Amino acid sequence: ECSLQSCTQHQPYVVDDPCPIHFYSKWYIRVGARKSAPLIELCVQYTVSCLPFTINCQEPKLGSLVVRCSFYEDFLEYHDVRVVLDFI
Amino acid sequence: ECSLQSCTQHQPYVVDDPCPIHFYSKWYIRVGARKSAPLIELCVQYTVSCLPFTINCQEPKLGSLVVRCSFYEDFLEYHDVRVVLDFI
């Protein structure tokens, strides 16, 4: 799955949670455009705040933002959602 | 809306139509990561075939592939869907 979000470049932006309502959230940065790339977990200048998760509206330099969604709190099954931005 | 498709880099790939079933299709290349960017219409080396629409599995150099979907043949209302690839 994939999420297209619009924001103003180089300005704070509260990222809309692409996961279904109630689903638990983990935010990552992947490396390269490659299917199985390593992930850098966020909230364990790009990152602005973690409460709520807000960023400066640009693409990170080494990968593309990713949200890990799960129906369960400890992620028995999870689904990833790439977050791609375009600039108004 | 957005579509994440997996393919093998630098190899022919038949793009899966992200539009709903039956919806009419126009394929474009936008310019830059900017919301209102000009569009280059395809099927009026990246492009491999138009029947069915197949490409070489990479990101185009100046923008990101886009599909224009419409319930009507002459596009009274249309919805765009960005196509983003990752590489297995």
From Swiss-Prot, chains A, B:
It holds the Pfam family bCoV_NS8. It is found in: Secreted. Changing residue 20 to S: In strain: Mu/B.1.621. One of its GO terms (molecular function) is identical protein binding. Residues 1-88 form the SARS ORF8 Ig-like domain. GO terms for cellular component: endoplasmic reticulum; extracellular region; extracellular space; lysosome. PROSITE patterns: SARS_ORF8_IG. One of its GO terms (biological process) is positive regulation of immunoglobulin mediated immune response. Glycosylated by the host when secreted via the conventional pathway. The glycosylated form cannot bind IL17A and would not participate in the cytokine storm. CDD domains: ORF8-Ig_SARS-CoV-2-like. The keyword Lyase does not apply. Changing residue 2 to A: Complete loss of dimerization. Its main location: secreted. Glycans are attached at residue 45. Changing residue 24 to H: Complete loss of hIL-17RA binding. Keywords: Disulfide bond, Evasion of host immunity by viral interleukin-like protein, Glycoprotein, Host-virus interaction, Secreted, Signal, Viral immunoevasion. Similar to some Bat coronavirus ns8 genes, but is entirely different from SARS ns8a or Ns8b. Elicits strong specific antibody response. Plays a role in modulating the host immune response. May act as a secreted virokine by mimicking interleukin-17A (IL17A), and thereby binding to the IL17RA receptor, leading to activation of the IL17 pathway and increased secretion of pro-inflammatory factors. Contributes to the cytokine storm during SARS-CoV-2 infection when secreted by unconventional pathway. May act by down-regulating major histocompability complex class I (MHC-I) at cell surface. May inhibit expression of some members of the IFN-stimulated gene (ISG) family including hosts IGF2BP1/ZBP1, MX1 and MX2, and DHX58. Homodimer. Interacts with host IL17RA. Interacts with host IL17RC. Interacts with host MHC-I. This is ORF8 protein. It comes from Severe acute respiratory syndrome coronavirus 2 (2019-nCoV).
